[PDB]
Design an enzyme around this catalytic site. Structure first.
Site, PDB file in Angstrom:
ATOM      1  N   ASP A  74     -58.714 -22.661 -77.782  1.00 17.06           N
ATOM      2  CA  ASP A  74     -57.757 -22.257 -78.174  1.00 17.06           C
ATOM      3  C   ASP A  74     -57.055 -23.649 -79.089  1.00 17.06           C
ATOM      4  O   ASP A  74     -57.143 -24.667 -79.868  1.00 17.06           O
ATOM      5  CB  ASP A  74     -56.988 -23.071 -76.776  1.00 17.06           C
TER       6      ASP A  74
ATOM      7  N   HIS B  15     -55.683 -19.408 -76.979  1.00 16.91           N
ATOM      8  CA  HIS B  15     -54.791 -19.678 -75.887  1.00 16.91           C
ATOM      9  C   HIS B  15     -53.717 -19.079 -75.212  1.00 16.91           C
ATOM     10  O   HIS B  15     -52.836 -19.013 -74.614  1.00 16.91           O
ATOM     11  CB  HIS B  15     -53.097 -19.790 -77.762  1.00 16.91           C
TER      12      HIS B  15
ATOM     13  N   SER C  46     -48.657 -23.021 -71.867  1.00 16.38           N
ATOM     14  CA  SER C  46     -48.032 -23.706 -73.115  1.00 16.38           C
ATOM     15  C   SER C  46     -47.334 -24.648 -73.301  1.00 16.38           C
ATOM     16  O   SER C  46     -47.280 -26.051 -72.431  1.00 16.38           O
ATOM     17  CB  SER C  46     -47.638 -22.268 -74.588  1.00 16.38           C
TER      18      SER C  46
END
Length: 259
Positions: free
Chosen positions: A176, A208, A130
């Site tokens: 995601d 995600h 991320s």
């Protein structure tokens, strides 16, 4: 013949197992003991008889601690790598800051850590989840000598990465909603015009948070990319080129074969 080659001739089963062939030792790095990052944990093969190993620094994402990705430490290290998983200065650090912290962690590992003699300082890499994946791109943009970069479900408002020369594997989660692949992963991938090699692995139906839990297909491709580019280990090209079919747990795969 390749002085950096380690471990047995690889197979699908070797890559999908919970551990690779090396027993793993660990050392904690206290936040009190370092500047430029928040400390973390180093994982390394106990064996020194087979030579030094390349190294990878790994960043968690926004709001997260290293524990969110801890399974990667022993799993990657057991294939013959020194892993430094970092805590960030604060949980809310942005991608550019995470990139600087990954480089500070690699510098600490090679210059001052108690395992520096086990690390080949010429063969380093970055990875992250991320915002830590956005930081992985930032680190590669700043340090073109890095041998591999693996942004995982990466998030970054910076969408273009022309400075990156490092072989880069982006692992995206098809579904995601926090770092959607259509606005983060895929634009980043298309923008890597100067990366020596690159690939995009999209995990079918994945959210995600796929890298927060042991994931054999993610590990297989991360380990293969690390072997091929950190160690120049052409034995692992068999898993990368020709690219795998987009079936089962892979919804898309983009490649720059041959390597």
């Amino acid at each position: 013949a390749n002085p950096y080659q380690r471990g047995p001739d690889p197979t699908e089963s070797l890559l999908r197992a919970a551990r690779g062939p090396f027993a793993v030792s660990e050392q904690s790095v206290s936040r009190l003991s370092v500047s430029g990052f928040g400390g973390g944990r180093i994982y390394y093969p106990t064996t020194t008889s087979q030579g030094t190993f390349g190294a990878i620094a790994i960043s968690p994402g926004f709001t997260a601690s290293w524990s969110s990705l801890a399974w990667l430490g022993p799993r990657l290290a057991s294939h013959g790598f020194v892993v430094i998983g970092i805590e960030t200065n604060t949980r809310l650090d942005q991608p550019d800051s995470r990139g600087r912290q990954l480089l500070a962690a690699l510098d600490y590992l090679t210059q001052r850590s108690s395992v520096r003699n086990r690390v080949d300082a010429s063969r380093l890499a970055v990875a992250g989840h991320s915002m830590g994946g956005g930081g992985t791109l930032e680190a590669a943009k700043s340090r073109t000598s890095l041998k591999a970069a693996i942004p995982i479900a990466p998030w970054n408002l910076d969408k273009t990465w022309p400075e990156v020369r490092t072989p880069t594997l982006i692992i995206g989660g098809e579904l995601d909603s926090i770092a959607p692949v259509a606005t983060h992963s895929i634009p980043f991938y298309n923008s890597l015009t100067n990366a020596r090699e690159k690939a995009y692995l999209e995990l079918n139906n994945a959210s995600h948070f796929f890298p927060q839990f042991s994931n054999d297909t993610m590990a297989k491709f991360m380990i293969s990319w690390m072997k091929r580019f950190i160690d120049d280990d052409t034995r692992y090209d068999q898993f990368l080129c020709p690219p795998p079919r987009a079936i089962g747990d892979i919804s898309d795969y983009r490649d720059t074969c041959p390597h």
